[PDB]
Amino acid sequence: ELLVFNFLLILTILTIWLFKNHRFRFLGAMVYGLIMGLILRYILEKMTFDPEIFFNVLLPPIIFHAGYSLKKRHFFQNLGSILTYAFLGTAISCIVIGLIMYGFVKAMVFHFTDCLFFGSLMSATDPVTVLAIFHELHVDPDLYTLLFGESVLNDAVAIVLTYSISIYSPAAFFQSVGNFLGIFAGSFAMGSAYAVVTALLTKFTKLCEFPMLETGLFFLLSWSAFLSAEAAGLTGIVAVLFCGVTQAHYTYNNLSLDSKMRTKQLFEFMNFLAENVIFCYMGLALFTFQNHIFNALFILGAFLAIFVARACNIYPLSFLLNLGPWNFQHMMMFSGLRGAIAFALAIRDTESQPKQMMFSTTLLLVFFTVWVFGGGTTPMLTWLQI
Amino acid sequence: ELLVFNFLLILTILTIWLFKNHRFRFLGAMVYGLIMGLILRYILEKMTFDPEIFFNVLLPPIIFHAGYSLKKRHFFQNLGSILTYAFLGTAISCIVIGLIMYGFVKAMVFHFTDCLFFGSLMSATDPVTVLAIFHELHVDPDLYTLLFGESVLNDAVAIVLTYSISIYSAAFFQSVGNFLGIFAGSFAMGSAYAVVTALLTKFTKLCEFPMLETGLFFLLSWSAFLSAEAAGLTGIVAVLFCGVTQAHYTYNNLSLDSKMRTKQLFEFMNFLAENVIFCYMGLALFTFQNHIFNALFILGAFLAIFVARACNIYPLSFLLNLGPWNFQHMMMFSGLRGAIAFALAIRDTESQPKQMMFSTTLLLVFFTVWVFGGGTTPMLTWLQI
C-alpha cells in the first residue's frame, strides 16, 4: 500500500483539472480507462488489491450526502411518485430475470438463483452525470426532483433486495420476503433512532455555541448509526445510514446557523471522492484478470434486457399514477445511467458462481456503454421536446 | 472488528460531552480509556488489533495541521531560538542514554544500541494540554509562539534521529550525514509540492471552483507524504511537516472561500487526535505479554525526565541570551511529554520481551505527566502571565 494510493492521486489531479479544462468542451474520470489501464500491461496486481469489504465502507459517505442534500421539494409534492417507483425495483428485478433467463438457456441451446441475483443487481439506477447537468442549468425543477428521488431510493431497495435473494434457499418463500420487510423496517427505525438523538440533543441544550463540538458529534453519531448496523447483525447498512435523511430536515435546522455550512461541506468533500469509485471500474477493468477472464458473448441478451426492462415498466407505473399532470414526457426522459452502486454488488466475493464472474464483465462494458446516454443527454433534450 | 470500531465512538462522544460541561469545573479525555478498559477487563484482543503501521498513517494529519496552524509571528523574532531548539532533541538523547545506562547496569549488581532508541524517543514533546490552556486564556503570546516551535520541531527530529540509529553498530561516521541528508531531502521534496501547489493556482483562477481546489490541496498535500514513503525517503511525518510553506504561499493567494474550509477540514482531523490519546489504555490492560512487565525502572526514568528537560535547556539558555528573555520562561519549559512519542514506542514491539520494558515505562510517563500537566495553573499564576 506504499505507492498503491499514489496511482490514484496523479490521475485524480487530471480529473480535477478536466472539470476546469473541459468546461466548454463537447465531452469525468471515465476517459482514463484506456490511458491508465493499458500502459501497465507489462507490482501489477498490487494496484487493485482493494478488498471488496473496503469498497462498502467508503460508499456510505457518498449516499449519506444524497440523503442530506434534499431540497425539501418532494416530501409532500412528489413523495407518492418516488414511493410508487420504490416498487419499480421489484418490477425491474422481475422483468430482467424474465429475459436473461431465456438468454443463457438459448445461448447453449449454472443455476437460476444467479439470474435472480443478476436482476436485483441490475435494478440499481443512479445517473450521477444526468443529475449534475440538470442542477447547473437552473431549469426543469420538477424533472430534476423526479430523477434525484428515484435514484436515491431504488439503490436502497436494490441492496436489501439482492441480500434476500442471496440468502434464499428452497414453504421457504415467506421468510425470504419477511427478511426484506424486516431488515428494511429495522433499517428505517434503528437508523433514524440515532438521528433522533442528535436532533433533540442540539435543540434543547445550547450546544450551538461550540461549532467544533457540534460538528464532531454529528459525524460520530451519524457514523455510529452506520456502525451499529453491522454490530446488531442487521444488513442494509447503507440504507441504515441513508435513513438519516431526517437529519437534514430536523437536526440540520435546530440551532446551528454556523455549522450548517461546515457539515454540508465536510460530507461534500467525501462525496467529491466518488472518482475513486468511478476509477475503480476502469482501474480494475484490466488488473482483475481472474475476474474478467471469461468475457463471454452473452452480453447481447443482457444488452437488450436492460434497455426494454426499464422502459417497459415505467410507463405502466405512470399510467397507474395517471388514474389518480406528469407532462406525459418525463417517463421517456427517465432513461439515464445504470447506477454507481451496481458495480459494488458485482464484486461480492467475485467467485460465488461461474457465471457470476461474467456479471462483472457485463457490468464494466455496460458502464462504458451507458455513459453515452449522459453524453447524448443534450440531444435527447433537444430531440423532440424539453 | 465491526463492533470494535463502534465503542471507540461512545467514549469519543463522551469526550465531546465533557468539554460541553467542563467550561467552569476545576479540571480530560485521557482517563476515559482506563474507564473503558476496566469495564472490559472483567473478543478481548480484537479491541486493540490496531496494526502499528496503520498508526503512522492517521498521525500525519495531526502534524500537517500543526504545521498549517503557525501564527506567522515566530519566524521573525524567535526563529533563531526555535532553530537552536532543534539541537535540544539531540542533546537530550545524549544525556538520557547515560542516565539510563546506569539504570540497569547498577541494578543488576539487551544491548547499548537499544538504550539509544529510548533516549532519542524522549526527545519528542507535544504539550497539547499546555498549549490548549494558553490560547483559551489569551496569555503569554510571546511564550506561546515559541513553545509551539520546539514542540513540533523536535518531533520531526525525533522520528528521523531514531531511524538513523538503524545503521549504528566505524558505522557512526555516516550516521550524521544520513540524518542530515534525509532531513534536508525531506525539506526539498516536501516543500516542492507546496511550490507546485502555489504556482498552479497563483496564475490560474481557481476561485471560481472553491470545491475543486480544496480537493486538489488535499490531493497535493497527501501526495507529498505518499511520495516520500514510496521513494524510500523516511521522516514522512517530517515531510508533511514541511507543508508549512503551504500556509506561507498557497493559503493566502486567491481562495477567500476555501481558506476557512481547508483549515476546518484539517483541524477536524486534528480534532480527532483522541484516537491517538485512546490507543494506550486498551493495550495497557489486554496485552499482558507486552505491558505487564513494569519493572522497577519507572523511578529511574522518572528522574531522567526532569534532568533531561533541565540539563539541556539551561546551558543553551546562556547562549541564546548572549545573542533579555526575563530568565523566567526557562523554568517553565518543564512541560508535557506528548503523544508522538508513543508512535515510536510501537515500532514493531517485538525486539525482546525483556527489552520491551521501555514501552511499559512510557505509558506510565504519560500518566505521571498528565497530573503534572493538570497542575499547570498553579505554576502559571506563580511565575507570570
Numbering used by the authors:
A (entry chain B): 23 to 49, 54 to 68, 123 to 189, 199 to 259, 269 to 422, 428 to 489
B (entry chain A): 23 to 49, 54 to 68, 123 to 189, 199 to 258, 269 to 422, 428 to 489
The authors write:
Here, we report the cryogenic electron microscopy structure of NHE isoform 9 (SLC9A9) from Equus caballus at 3.2 Å resolution, an endosomal isoform highly expressed in the brain and associated with autism spectrum (ASD) and attention deficit hyperactivity (ADHD) disorders. Despite low sequence identity, the NHE9 architecture and ion‐binding site are remarkably similar to distantly related bacterial Na+/H+ antiporters with 13 transmembrane segments. The NHE9 monomer consists of 13 TMs with an extracellular N‐terminus and intracellular C‐terminus.
NHE9* sample preparation was optimized for grid preparation, cryo‐EM data acquisition and structural determination at an active pH of 7.5. We combined 3D classes from two independent data collections of ~ 1.4 million particles, from which an EM map was reconstructed to 3.5 Å according to the gold‐standard Fourier shell correlation (FSC) 0.143 criterion, which used ~ 5% of the total collected particles. The NHE9* construct contains 97 residues of the C‐terminal regulatory domain (blue‐dotted circle), but no corresponding additional density was apparent as compared to the NHE9 ΔCTD density maps. Despite extensive efforts, we were unable to obtain any structural information for the regulatory domain of NHE9. It, therefore, seems unlikely that the C‐terminal tail in NHE9 interacts tightly with the transporter module in the absence of binding partners. As model building revealed only minor differences between NHE9* and NHE9 ΔCTD structures, the later was used for all subsequent analysis due to its moderately better resolution.
